[PDB]
C-alpha cells in the first residue's frame, strides 16, 4: 500500500469509526458528527448543528461519505494554502 493509498484508506477508516453508532451505518447524524469532530478535529469547532447544515448537500440531515470527504479536502486545502503564503 502506498503512502497516498494509505491516507485515503485512513479517511475512510475514520469515517466508518463514527458513522455506525446510530441510524444509517453509512452516514453521520448530528450526534455522530459531534463525536467525530471532538475526537478527530478537536478545537475546530450551536457549532455542530450549523456544521451539519453546511455539509449536508442533499438535505437528509446527515453527512454521508461524499459530503464528509469534500469537507476533509477543504480543511486540508486551507492548511496547504496557508503555508504556501507564509512562504514569502
| Dihedral sign computed on CA atoms, order 53, 54, 56, 58 | positive
Look at residue 1 and give its three-state secondary structure.
coil
CB of 60 to a second copy, least distance (A): 15
> From residue 32 to residue 61, what is the string marking binding to Ca ion with x (rule CB under 5 A)?
------------------------x-x-x-
CB of 76 to a second copy, least distance (A): 4
By a kind-dependent CB cut-off of 5 to 8 A, residue 23 interacts, out of Ca ion, a second copy, none, with Ca ion
Residue from 15, 19, 51, 68 binding Ca ion (CB under 5 A) = 19
β pairing state of 63-64 and 27-28 = antiparallel
Give the 3-state DSSP-derived string for 10-60, with helices as H, strands as E and coil as C.
HHHHHHHHHCCCCCCCCEECHHHHHHHHHHHCCCCCCHHHHHHHHHCCCCC
CB of 62 to a second copy, least distance (A): 14
By a kind-dependent CB cut-off of 5 to 8 A, residue 70 interacts, out of Ca ion, a second copy, none, with a second copy
Does residue 18 bind Ca ion (CB under 5 A)? Answer: no
Amino acid at each position: 500500500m502506498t503512502e497516498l493509498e494509505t491516507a485515503m484508506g485512513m479517511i475512510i477508516d475514520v469515517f466508518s469509526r463514527y458513522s455506525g453508532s446510530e441510524g444509517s451505518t453509512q452516514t453521520l447524524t448530528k450526534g455522530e458528527l459531534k463525536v467525530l469532530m471532538e475526537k478527530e478535529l478537536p478545537g475546530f469547532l450551536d457549532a455542530v448543528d450549523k456544521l451539519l447544515k453546511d455539509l449536508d448537500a442533499n438535505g437528509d440531515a446527515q453527512v454521508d461519505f461524499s459530503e464528509f470527504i469534500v469537507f476533509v479536502a477543504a480543511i486540508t486545502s486551507a492548511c496547504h494554502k496557508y503555508f504556501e503564503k507564509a512562504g514569502l
